[PDB]
């Protein structure tokens, strides 16, 4: 079977301008497990990202947490970009600063 990823973007702690923090890109509910995830700062790929182990839910769909250390500022825009066999083109979700 094939399953399309869900993508959420949120910070680990409440963001404050100029304060170090972590930004998460949580990708879930997908199958097969091959997946490509980049975190972006003003449209540019962030190198220093890590991820938790690829794991899976009771319905056997996979999930994956990507995250990166970041220091948000008023002007900076962050995003998560995901490609998967189920998608025509990469899907970009923007960090919404806790305002959905």
């Amino acid at each position: 079977i094939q399953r399309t990823p869900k993508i959420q973007v949120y910070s680990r702690h409440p963001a404050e301008n100029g304060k170090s923090n972590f930004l998460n890109c949580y990708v879930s509910g997908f199958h097969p497990s091959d997946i490509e995830v980049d975190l972006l700062k003003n449209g540019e790929r962030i190198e220093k990202v890590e991820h938790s182990d690829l794991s899976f839910s009771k319905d056997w769909s996979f999930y994956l947490l990507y995250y990166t250390e970041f220091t948000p500022t008023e002007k900076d825009e962050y995003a998560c970009r995901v490609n998967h066999v189920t998608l025509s083109q990469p899907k970009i979700v923007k960090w919404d600063r806790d305002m959905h």
Partner: protein
């Protein structure tokens, strides 16, 4: 005898019979509760009594392992509780017995033994003396599944005597706790030595064990002729083969016959035995095993005459190679009672290797004329090792000495887990207080002897769940070269280091509440983890990173929001640790 169970019950008496059967059950089925074992033991013993009354009665002819295995498998078929022991119960003898022996757990995960208050112990003793002593046998036996069973009977007799006397004393704890502490220490030593005897016999064979026994008895009985040593060694090999195979009733019976043989032949063995041989049975056997060495013959020739110079050296060797090497070990050992036996065995192995090569050669006498020179380095390497380690020990003290050995063994065996490495380093570090305090001259024999049992304990556990090929090689190649083999291990460059990540140091607030023996294990665990991130790290790099760790802990355990401090500071410690290690 048409009934082995009747034979052993008769030879041993009911009290020792029942105690040995309880030991046997507790050692085979270590997770089984005390009350279940007492029930089975009592059933077995009543049955035994019907065979004594009538050796022809039903099932009285069956083998001990058939009877005892059958009893155990009334409860051990439950895989939920007994694991693979349920598969042993699927087999028949003799396969069943070997399967139980393979599954004896050298690392049972059993509750620490916390002594109750003396008044409480004395009340339990008084309220039900037999049950109290059975619990003692059961708890020791199940934690030490190779404890030498007939000696455990004597521990129990001393344990009973300590309670009998001290529970009626004015200061009960000051009479009792010293006695219990001496027995506990003696028991740990006895257990470790027996585990190595059983490993030698089971993994290396009777020749290896006999070499050990010849050397050791020759030190203790240097005036005995070689033929008498050889006879005692044959006797003693059967006793320990039987105990290590789970044949505990036979082991105890044969040990009693050996003690009587010795006491009836003192003039052929040693002049130090008179008092031992006047004690009752268990004290007698114990006393014989501990007695001091006889004085060696006043004027012994050099070994050169018979093993170097004589013209028939290769002649005698080739017609009875192990007898000739045995006499070499007997002659060398009786002249050197202060040597460690394992070193003596390395000398005999070197000698053997030299005769194997040279007696094929053109002129043997010239090929092996300097063989005794090869012994000088074999003595020197161990002495330098223990000198270095005792200096380090006296500079560093106990905890930091352990930490240095922890780093050394993580570098050697990074495939082991932190808990394993911590425990290995703790056991190795006790060599510090056990041996470095002795006179200079006794330090190296003490250490070779103690390290042999520590490494063997590591080896018997590694064999069941192996993780380093280098450990497997050191454990299986040759028993007598184990300690040098482990010493030679350099940092393992095949180990792929752990990578640092944002979660490498993830802690919760629970660590701020611990006893700093608990905090010590956290620090030790951290030291293992740092080495695993850079196996070649230096002492200075490690000290810098551990100082960071300690400041991180102090910072966050004072904080108003502790979990948040730990979330925010963990990744900072990761960055500082990487730098400290040079990445």
């Amino acid at each position: 005898h048409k009934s082995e169970v009747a034979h052993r019950f008769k030879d041993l008496g009911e009290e020792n019979f029942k105690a040995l059967v309880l030991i046997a059950f507790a050692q085979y089925l270590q997770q089984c509760p005390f009350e279940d074992h007492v029930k089975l033991v009592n059933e077995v013993t009543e049955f035994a009594k019907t065979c004594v009354a009538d050796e022809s009665a039903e099932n009285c002819d069956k083998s001990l392992h058939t009877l005892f295995g059958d009893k155990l498998c009334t409860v051990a078929t439950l895989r939920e509780t007994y694991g693979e022991m349920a598969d042993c119960c699927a087999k028949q003898e003799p396969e069943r017995n070997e399967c139980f022996l393979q599954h004896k757990d050298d690392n049972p995960n059993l509750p620490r033994l916390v002594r109750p208050e003396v008044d409480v112990m004395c009340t339990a003793f008084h309220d039900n003396e037999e049950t109290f002593l059975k619990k003692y046998l059961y708890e020791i036996a199940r934690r030490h599944p190779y404890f030498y069973a007939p000696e455990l009977l004597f521990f129990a007799k001393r344990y009973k005597a300590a309670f009998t006397e001290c529970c009626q004393a004015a200061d009960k704890a000051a009479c009792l706790l010293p006695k219990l502490d001496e027995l506990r220490d003696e028991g740990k030593a006895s257990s470790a030595k027996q585990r190595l005897k059983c490993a030698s016999l089971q993994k290396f064979g009777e020749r290896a064990f006999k070499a050990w026994a010849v050397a050791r008895l020759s030190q203790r009985f240097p005036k005995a002729e070689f033929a008498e040593v050889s006879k005692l060694v044959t006797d003693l090999t059967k006793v320990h083969t039987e105990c290590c195979h789970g044949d505990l009733l036979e082991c105890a019976d044969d040990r009693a016959d050996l003690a009587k043989y010795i006491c009836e032949n003192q003039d052929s063995i040693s002049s130090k035995l008179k008092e031992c041989c006047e004690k009752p049975l268990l004290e007698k056997s114990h006393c014989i095993a501990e007695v001091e060495n006889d004085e060696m013959p006043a004027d012994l020739p050099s070994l050169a005459a018979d093993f170097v110079e004589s013209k028939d050296v290769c002649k005698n060797y080739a017609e009875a190679k192990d007898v000739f090497l045995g006499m070499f070990l007997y002659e060398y050992a009786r002249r050197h009672p202060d040597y460690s036996v394992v070193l003596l065995l390395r000398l005999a192995k070197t000698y053997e290797t030299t005769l194997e090569k040279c007696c094929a050669a053109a002129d043997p006498h010239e090929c092996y004329a300097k063989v005794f020179d090869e012994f000088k380095p074999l003595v020197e390497e161990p002495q330098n090792l223990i000198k270095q380690n005792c200096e380090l020990f006296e500079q560093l003290g106990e905890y930091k000495f352990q930490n240095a050995l922890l780093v050394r063994y993580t570098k050697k065996v990074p495939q082991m887990s932190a808990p394993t490495l911590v425990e290995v380093s703790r056991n190795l570090g006790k060599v510090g207080s056990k041996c470095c305090k002795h006179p200079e001259a006794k330090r190296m024999p003490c250490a070779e002897d103690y390290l042999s049992v520590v490494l063997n304990q590591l080896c018997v556990l590694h064999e069941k769940t192996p993780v380093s090929d280098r450990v497997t090689k050191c454990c299986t190649e040759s028993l007598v070269n184990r300690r040098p083999c482990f010493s030679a291990l350099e940092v393992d460059e095949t180990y792929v280091p752990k990578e640092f990540n944002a979660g490498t140091f993830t802690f919760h607030a629970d660590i701020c509440t611990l006893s700093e023996k608990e905090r010590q294990i956290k620090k030790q665990t951290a030291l293992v983890e740092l080495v695993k991130h850079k196996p070649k790290a230096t002492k200075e790099q490690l000290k810098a990173a551990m100082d960071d760790f300690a400041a991180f802990v102090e910072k966050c355990c004072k904080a108003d929001d502790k979990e948040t401090c730990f979330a925010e500071e963990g990744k900072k410690l990761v960055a500082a640790s990487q730098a400290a290690l040079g990445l």
